[PDB]
Amino acid sequence: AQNRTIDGTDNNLSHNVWGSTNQHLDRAGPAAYADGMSMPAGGSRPSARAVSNGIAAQTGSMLNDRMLSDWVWQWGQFLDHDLDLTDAASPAESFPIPVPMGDPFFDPFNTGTQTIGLSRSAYDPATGSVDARQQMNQITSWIDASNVYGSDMTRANALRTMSGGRLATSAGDLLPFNTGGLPNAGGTSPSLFLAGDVRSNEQSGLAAVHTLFVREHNRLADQIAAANPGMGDEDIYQQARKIVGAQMQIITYNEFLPALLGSAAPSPMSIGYDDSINPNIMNEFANACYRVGHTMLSPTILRLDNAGNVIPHGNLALQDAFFNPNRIINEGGIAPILKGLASQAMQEIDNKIVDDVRNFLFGGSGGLDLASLNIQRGRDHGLPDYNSTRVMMGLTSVSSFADISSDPAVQAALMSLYGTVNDIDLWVGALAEDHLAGSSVGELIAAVLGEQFTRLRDGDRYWYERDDFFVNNPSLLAELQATRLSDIIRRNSDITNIQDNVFLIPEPATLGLLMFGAAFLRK
Ligand code: HEM
Ligand SMILES: [Ca+2]
Ligand SMILES: [Ca+2]
Ligand SMILES: [Mg+2]
C-alpha cells in the first residue's frame, strides 16, 4: 500500500510540504513581536523568573482531582515529541532571563545580576527582518510515530537493522546506543540511547516509552515475517511502522485525550479527509498551551514490581532521571517505570510547578527553571497575550482577573505581576483558568488542544481509519481499534498486574492487596 514519507511530505497532495520537517509553525493569528519583526513579545512584563516566583512556586504536593496517573504527562511528552521540535537558532541569539535580586535559588548572594540562559529558537531565515519571525518545526507535524522512526531518511535508516523489518536494539531489548554519533539531546556520546526523536534521553520515563514502542515494532515485524514469509525487509518495516503509527493515533484519541480533556475531548473518529487544513503545529500550541506537561510532573517516578512493591534500587527522583541511560540499564529496565507511571496520581493542572523542575540547581551556581523557560520561550516566539489568544480562538475576552480564576490567591498573583488582564503571558493565563466541568483543563487550553487535535485527525491523509492498508485489512483495523496502551505494555514486558486504562490510577486498595504475602515495607 502507499506508505507515509519519513519526512511528512507528500501527505497533502497539493501543499506537499505541509506537515513536513522544517515547515513554519502555524499561527492562530498575528504574532506579537514588539516591532512586528523579531523583537520579543512581552517586553512590558516582569522577568519570566519573577513570574515563576510569583505564581508557579509550589510548596507542597497537590494531586490532580480527576484520578489521572503519571501516564497522562508521560504520554503527553512522548506525543509532543511526535508533534513538534524547535531547537536553538545558530548562530546563537542570547535572550537571557533576569534573576530577581536575592532570589534564594538563583541569586543567593544578592548580586542583582544573575540570569537564566536562553538561546532563541530556530526560524525561517526569510522571516523576521522585514516581517514577523516564524519559528520552524523540525519534525513531522503528523501523528506518525516520527518519535520512533525519525523525521529524516538518514536517521530512519540508522535506526533500522535492514533485516526482517526490524529496528536496532541494545542488550536487554533496550534502545540502541548512538554509536554513529547522530544528533541527540545530551550530546553525541555513544553511551546515550538513539531513538526516532532526538530528545529520548531527556528523562528515563520518556526513554522507557521510546523503548516500549521499539519493542512493539520488533514484535510486529517478527510476527509479520513469521506469518508472511518471503516478504522483504522494507515491506515488513513499513507494515510494522504503519501499525505503530496507527497505535499512536488510537492511544492519543481514545485514551490520552479523553483522560486529560474529559468532557472537552475531540471525537476519536474523523469526520472525513479535509485537505484544506493546515497541519503545521500551531506556535501557540507547541510553545504554550500544550506545555501543560510541566504542571502535571511528579517529583518521583515510581518503580514497582508485579506485587506493587518498590524495586530494590528505589523509586526514581525526577532530577536523577535526566540524561542518564544507567537508570534503565542498571536499575531494573523499563518495566518498573511502565508500571510505576500507572500507579501514581499526577500533580494538578494549575500554575504550580514542582521545585524539582522549577528550581533545578546544578551546584548560586546556576541551573534550570522550566517555568521561566516556557514563559521566556513564548516571548521569543512572539506569542499573543492570553486574552488576545482567547479572542483568536472565538472565546469571550476576559475583563477582570476574576474572569480568569476563582482562586483569590491566583487572582492576586496575576494582579501583582501583570496589572492588566490584557498583558498576561499566554502560558500563565492558560494554566490559571478554572477547569471546565468534567475536565482537567480550562476553556482556553481545551479550545487550543481541541483545535490542534481536530486538525491532525481530519487533515492527515494517513489517518488510520482511511489508510488503504487498514481499509483492505479490516480485521487488523479492528484489532488496532481494540488496542490499549496496557496491551502494548503487557506484551512487551514482564508486567502482569496493571489496570486496563493506565491513564487512571488503580483502586486505592489494589497495591496493598496485591502486596499481601509479599510486601516489602522498608523501601
Ligand atoms: C520530565 C518531564 C519533562 C521535561 C523534563 C520537559 C522538558 C522540556 C524542556 C527543557 C523543554 C524546552 C524548554 C525551552 O527551552 O523552551 C520542553 C519543551 C516542551 N515540552 Fe516539556 N518537559 C517535560 C514534560 C512535558 C510534557 C508532559 C508535555 C506535554 C504534555 C511537554 C510538552 C512540551 C512542549 C510542547 C515543548 C515544546 C517542544 C518543541 O516544540 O520544541 N513536556 N520540555
Ligand atoms: Ca510526527
Ligand atoms: Ca501543577
Ligand atoms: Mg533496505
Residue numbers in the entry: 1 to 363, 366 to 525
What does the literature reporting this entry say, word for word?
Although CyanoPOX shares relatively low sequence identity (37 %) with bovine lactoperoxidase, it displays comparable biochemical properties.
Also, CyanoPOX in the crystal structure seems monomeric, with a size of 55×50×44 Å. On the proximal heme site the conserved residues, His294, Leu372, Asn376 and Arg291 are situated. His81 is identified as the distal heme ligand. The covalent bonds with the methyl groups of the heme observed in mammalian peroxidases to Asp80 and Glu202 (CyanoPOX numbering), through two ester bonds between OD2‐Asp and heme atom CMD, and OE2‐Glu and heme atom CMB, are absent, but the residues nevertheless remain. A conserved calcium ion is observed on the distal site of the heme (11 Å to His81). Another non‐conserved calcium ion (10 Å to His294) is liganded by the sidechain of Asp350, the carbonyl oxygen and OG1 of Thr295 (adjacent to His294), the carbonyl oxygens of Glu348 and Lys352, and two water molecules.
